[PDB]
Write an enzyme that holds these catalytic residues in place. Structure first.
Site, short mmCIF file in Angstrom:
data_model
loop_
_atom_site.label_atom_id
_atom_site.label_comp_id
_atom_site.label_asym_id
_atom_site.label_seq_id
_atom_site.Cartn_x
_atom_site.Cartn_y
_atom_site.Cartn_z
CD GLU A 95 -100.20 11.23 -23.98
OE1 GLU A 95 -99.06 11.54 -23.58
OE2 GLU A 95 -100.65 11.53 -25.10
CD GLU A 107 -101.50 16.06 -26.15
OE1 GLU A 107 -101.52 16.10 -24.90
OE2 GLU A 107 -100.58 15.52 -26.80
CB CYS A 126 -99.63 16.38 -32.14
SG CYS A 126 -99.51 14.94 -31.04
CG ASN A 162 -112.62 12.54 -32.68
OD1 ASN A 162 -112.45 12.36 -31.47
ND2 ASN A 162 -111.73 12.16 -33.59
C1 P9V Z 1 -99.19 10.30 -27.17
S1 P9V Z 1 -97.43 9.82 -27.25
C2 P9V Z 1 -96.42 11.34 -26.97
C3 P9V Z 1 -97.10 12.37 -26.07
C4 P9V Z 1 -98.14 13.38 -26.64
N1 P9V Z 1 -99.03 13.84 -25.56
C5 P9V Z 1 -98.13 14.47 -24.58
C6 P9V Z 1 -97.35 15.62 -25.15
O1 P9V Z 1 -96.47 16.05 -24.12
C7 P9V Z 1 -96.50 15.12 -26.33
O2 P9V Z 1 -95.70 16.19 -26.84
C8 P9V Z 1 -97.42 14.51 -27.41
O3 P9V Z 1 -96.66 14.04 -28.52
#
Ligand code: P9V
Ligand SMILES: *[C@@H]1O[C@H](CO)[C@@H](O[C@@H]2O[C@H](CO)[C@@H](O)[C@H](O)[C@H]2NC(C)=O)[C@H](O)[C@H]1NC(C)=O
Ligand SMILES: *[C@@H]1O[C@H](CO[C@@H]2O[C@@H](C)[C@@H](O)[C@@H](O)[C@@H]2O)[C@@H](O)[C@H](O)[C@H]1NC(C)=O
Length: 489
Positions: free
Chosen positions: A235, A335, A337, A362
């Protein structure tokens, strides 16, 4: 062989209880004859990837919805499915007794389980660590003479990765992502907050950070672990936000482009690990297609970029348009979540549906692989050194030597177990407007896979036609997910 032990925690569905002596599992797969299909069913009512079989009939009679396989309409080939071996995940697995740890690892990576083949490995600490750290925290070490792996790698992460690979039938691909560089390479001298690398692409700072990638890959190579790919930065847009709480490293799209072209690309190409793929972005898909235009229009950067990594946290305007502009650069979900709700919802069927619906979207927009976040977490969604507690398909209860497999685990498994590496997504035409989510793929061996997700409450009668075989009469119950498999010859 062993069915799920259900337990409710007050949410819409059950978890499956596993401990040191019991965990639900599959038998080795079989090859049923032509004219016969296999169906795996999970339901909110409590069914968990239950196997059944039936016939594929020569004729059809009925008035309902029809999905027709179109094997000649061929799309992307699949890299695989998996999750992230974070510090938090490693700590939660190793808190169990050895027999329970292996039932957990077999649940993910074994043919008795759902056959993961991708592990995402963070390079040093992220928010799902119990402490801040990098691999080279002594300052003014631009040759990186004091680069070393801490206990998190040598004691927790690497031994678990070795054990996952031993249990797995299919080859497993490792994917590495950095969160932050050493703080003496950053503009703000901090592990978090708004800050990029010091100086400009080409200088000693950017050459040191690029070398950090090779040093990381060297270290794991000494531990007999090779990587399929690395991402340029986890990110990178987050490191441009003011006062960002997790470990980060800021890159604007042009900074990533120049850092790849001048530093990261050449250094990786001149090294022992020149075959390791480089993925760009590794960020929210709303940054697409712009981020792709900036990086991939520069041939000096593009020659080094193998794919575009995306996070899940409209798909046509982002994934589809990026594919239209760069159809030879693969898209990969690295990623995913899951405001007013708690971080862990033991037994939430909704969060499972969220996983499978997203994977289907996707796949329908050229993405070649999807990677979960933490492989395991504790009942509060940690450990996390900042706050950001989230859910995870497996929730470990240390005090009872017990772990729980969420509905997310099975919604993932409906894809990860039956779509091996090399599968190609193919056409699947709906006869009329409907409420289902469906995707069709072809195995490397020619057999067919169709996943059918029903997020509505109503049962949907359904026929699947294979032009080469016949008609599969079935019903998609409300709040259910099915996977169908059949030989085509
Ligand atoms: C996309 S916003 C927050 C960041 C996310 N990608 C990085 C990981 O470390 C975090 O735990 C997950 O929530
Ligand atoms: C680990 O899980 C298994 C599976 O539930 C437990 O075995 C069950 O034990 C109960 C006793 O409360 C019996 O009624 C069931 O018939 C058992 N299920 C089986 C054998 O499949 C086991 O007790 C759990 N471990 C611990 C320490 O509680
Ligand atoms: C499949 O069935 C087709 C339709 O069958 C005909 O119409 C129905 C309404 C009944 O009246 C039935 O008795 C009729 O024969 C056939 O036209 C077709 O040949 C059949 N094909 C196969 C492969 O069985």
């Amino acid at each position: 062989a062993r069915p799920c032990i259900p337990k409710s925690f007050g949410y819409s569905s059950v978890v499956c209880v596993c401990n040191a002596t019991y965990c639900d599992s599959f038998d080795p797969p079989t090859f049923p004859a032509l004219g016969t299909f296999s169906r795996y069913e999970s339901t909110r009512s409590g069914r968990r990837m239950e196997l059944s079989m039936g016939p594929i009939q020569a004729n059809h009679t009925g008035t309902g919805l029809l999905l027709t396989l179109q094997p000649e309409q061929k799309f992307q080939k699949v890299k695989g499915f998996g999750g992230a071996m974070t510090d938090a995940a490693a700590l939660n697995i190793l808190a169990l007794s050895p027999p329970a740890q292996n039932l957990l690892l077999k649940s993910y990576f074994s043919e008795e389980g759902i056959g993961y083949n991708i592990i995402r490995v963070p390079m040093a600490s992220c928010d799902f660590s119990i402490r801040t750290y990098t691999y080279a925290d002594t300052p003014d070490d631009f040759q990186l003479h004091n680069f070393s792996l801490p206990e998190e790698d040598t004691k927790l992460k690497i031994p678990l990765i070795h054990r996952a690979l031993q249990l797995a039938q299919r080859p497993v691909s490792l994917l590495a992502s950095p969160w932050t560089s050493p703080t003496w390479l950053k503009t703000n001298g901090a592990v978090n907050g708004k800050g990029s690398l010091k100086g400009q692409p080409g200088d000693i700072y950017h050459q040191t950070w690029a070398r950090y990638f090779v040093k990381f890959l060297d270290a794991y190579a000494e531990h007999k672990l090779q990587f399929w790919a690395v991402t340029a930065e986890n990110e990178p847009s987050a490191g441009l936000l003011s006062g960002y709480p997790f470990q980060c490293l800021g890159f604007t799209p042009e900074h990533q482009r120049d850092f790849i072209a001048r530093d990261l690309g050449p250094t990786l190409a001149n090294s022992t690990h020149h075959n390791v793929r480089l993925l760009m972005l590794d960020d929210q898909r709303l940054l697409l297609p712009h981020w792709a235009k900036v990086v991939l229009t520069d041939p000096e950067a593009a020659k080094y970029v193998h794919g575009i990594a995306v996070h899940w946290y409209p798909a046509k305007a982002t994934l589809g348009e990026t594919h239209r502009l760069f159809p030879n650069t693969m898209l990969f979900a690295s990623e995913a979540c899951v405001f007013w709700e708690q971080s862990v919802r033991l037994g939430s069927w909704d969060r499972g549906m969220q996983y499978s619906h997203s994977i289907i979207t996707n796949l329908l927009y050229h993405v070649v692989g999807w990677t979960d976040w933490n492989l395991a977490l504790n009942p509060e969604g940690g450990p996390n050194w900042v706050r950001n507690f989230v859910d995870s398909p497996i929730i470990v209860d240390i005090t009872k030597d017990t772990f729980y497999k969420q509905p997310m685990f099975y919604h993932l498994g409906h894809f990860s177990k039956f779509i091996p590496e090399g599968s190609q997504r193919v056409g699947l035409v709906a006869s009329q407007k409907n409420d289902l989510d469906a995707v069709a793929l072809m195995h490397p061996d020619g057999s067919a896979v169709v996943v059918v997700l029903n997020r509505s409450s109503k049962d949907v009668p359904l026929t699947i036609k294979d032009p080469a075989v016949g008609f599969l009469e079935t019903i998609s119950p409300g709040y259910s997910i099915h996977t169908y498999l059949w030989h085509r010859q």
